[PDB]
């Protein structure tokens with residue numbers, strides 16, 4: 538069973554801006570996803586301090602970067618808190634309506650696209666490089682779900698019968714044809730060092 542949803546008009550607008558604005562500094566997408574992963578890992582870590590059973594779905598708190606040149610995908614995996622069905626539908630747990638509004642106001646007053654993450658809508662920077670994004674997620678309080686969107690105003694949600702993950706979020710970037718540099722090991726290392734050097738969790742870059 539696949540449910541199709543319309544993005545709120547503001548989010549559809551934000552996505553169209555990201556996809557259609559000329560902006561060469563696309564590499565910032567990765568730091569935005571690593572930042573989201575790090576936030577989700579902080580959440581599970583903090584909740585686990587009063588309830589250790591929250592880590593029964595996995596004790597390791599980490600980030601994996603998985604390039605696949607055959608599929609032309611870059612996948613960002615974490616073992617953070619994950620998201621419920623309600624969170625996914627509600628703009629992947631972001632303050633997207635108010636954040637978009639504030640972001641647009643900032644862009645009028647001298648901000649640029651790289652500042653997207655300051656407004657809580659950094660996830661959408663995935664569309665700088667990806668023609669389609671798949672989000673697989675597992676929260677302790679819910680079952681596993683796949684969110685998907687190629688933009689164009691809509692997204693889908695279905696139950697994911699997996700590859701079960703114990704807990705966390707997997708972001709699969711189906712890269713645009715001209716963005717395959719982000720599958721190269723030396724390029725990924727360079728971007729992690731430039732923008733995400735000092736992060737509170739291990740980042741493992743998988744080799745092919």
Ligand SMILES: CC(C)c1cc(C(=O)N2Cc3ccccc3C2)c(O)cc1O
Pocket residue numbers: 570573574575576577578580615617618619620629630631660672674705706708
């Ligand atoms: C898709 C994107 C928004 C994203 C989400 C997560 C995620 O699971 N969460 C849950 C959570 C709880 C508190 C604070 C932030 C977050 C983000 C993720 O792990 C990675 C992502 O790219």
